[PDB]
Design a protein around this ligand. Structure first.
Ligand SMILES: [Ca+2]
Ligand SMILES: [Ca+2]
Ligand SMILES: [Ca+2]
Length: 387
């Protein structure tokens, strides 16, 4: 980068978005609820773009994409619930395959249970994760881990999962053939019909990532993630994209404590239990190098670094934010949050099982919402008018 542009990014990354003590977080919270509400109460239906691929168009079903679920055998019924909703609101008209991964061996009953609730011609693949692509690596000092996890109270397997979903899933052999994943978790809800091919929408409009919910994280899980990340970026300034979502990373105005705790990160992240992702990005040098650097720091184990903030940092820093799409139209819930859009009055696109704009039923969690920051600072001119 031109030194001036780069310098100006570095400056922004080293200072809070709003000067300390020039704002009251409670007023910021209210303003932000209001901004969120304006978007959520707007009547929308689908992206206002040219190229949407309908069900049965020649391009429908032709993206190299899969729906991906990381599961244990005991998740069978919960993942079935999610699958049925996904099929009902979207995939019954497009027929993308499912890929299931598990750190243990899948049982035949899991597999048959899955197959029994999908159409006969729906393609499903089940893959085990090699122990060496899951387990705590040798580079981690286990007693140091045990010590840190003693204080922090945890399941080792949760740490493995976070790491796996940060840096390994996209290397799984079953995924080598795909460019796109729609990540699906157990026990979620979808509320609204999607009548265009989501992957083709991504490809045709150059979106590398899609999300529905955007949240604050727990700062104690990621104590040195941001500081380490800052040092990484200073060693690889060429990985920065000039239109990174830098303000979103630096917004200290709603939860200034989260910012102080991390010494510079809002903790805002895409809530990755839902994600649509272009794997070219995760396979690209900046993302792979960042993952190797976090692997070397050990924070996946010495701290509790979630795949969400990790993914989000990399997306914010190494890509143009205008390529990150907020799927406002995908009504979605995973406890305790819901993205529930508003339809025109005559529309049956949404099934009526979510209350439009009701982010969570527990108003104490309202300040975990980071969507307003995303709207205010990260949405490109195109994204702002896209619905
Ligand atoms: Ca400067
Ligand atoms: Ca620095
Ligand atoms: Ca430094």
């Amino acid at each position: 980068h031109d030194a001036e542009v780069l310098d100006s990014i570095m400056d922004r990354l080293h200072e809070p978005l709003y000067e300390k003590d020039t704002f009251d977080p409670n007023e910021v919270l209210a303003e932000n609820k209001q901004l969120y509400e304006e978007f959520l109460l707007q009547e929308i239906s689908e992206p206002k773009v040219d190229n949407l691929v309908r069900s049965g168009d020649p391009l429908a079903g032709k993206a190299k994409g899969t729906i991906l679920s990381l599961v244990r055998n005991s998740d069978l019924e919960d993942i079935i619930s999610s699958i049925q909703q996904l099929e009902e609101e979207y995939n019954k008209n497009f027929g993308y395959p499912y890929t299931f991964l598990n750190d243990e061996e899948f049982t035949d009953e899991f597999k048959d249970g899955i197959k029994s609730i999908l159409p006969k011609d729906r393609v499903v693949e089940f893959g085990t994760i090699g122990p060496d692509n899951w387990n705590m690596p040798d580079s981690i000092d286990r007693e140091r881990y045990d010590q840190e996890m003693d204080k922090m109270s945890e399941v080792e397997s949760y740490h493995n999962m976070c790491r796996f979903y940060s840096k390994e899933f996209y290397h799984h052999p079953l995924l080598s053939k795909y460019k796109y994943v729609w990540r699906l978790e157990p026990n979620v809800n979808f509320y609204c019909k999607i009548n265009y091919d989501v992957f083709q929408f991504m490809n045709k409009n150059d979106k590398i990532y899609g999300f529905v919910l955007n949240l604050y994280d727990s700062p104690q899980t990621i104590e040195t993630l941001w500081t380490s990340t800052m040092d990484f970026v200073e060693e690889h300034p060429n990985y920065l994209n000039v239109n990174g979502a830098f303000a979103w990373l630096k917004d200290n105005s709603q939860n200034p404590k989260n910012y102080d705790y991390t010494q510079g990160y809002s903790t805002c992240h895409f809530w990755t239990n839902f994600e649509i992702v272009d794997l070219d990005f995760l396979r690209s040098e900046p993302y792979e190098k960042y993952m190797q650097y976090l692997e070397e720091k050990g924070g996946f184990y010495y701290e509790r670094w979630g795949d969400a903030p990790v993914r989000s940092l990399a997306l914010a820093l190494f890509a143009d934010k205008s390529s990150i799409h907020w799927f406002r139209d995908i009504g979605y819930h995973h406890t305790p949050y819901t993205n529930c859009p508003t339809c025109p009055a005559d529309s049956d696109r949404c099934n009526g099982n979510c209350v439009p704009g009701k982010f969570t039923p527990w108003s104490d969690l309202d300040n975990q919402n980071c969507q307003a920051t995303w709207i205010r600072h990260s949405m490109s001119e195109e994204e702002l008018e896209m619905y």
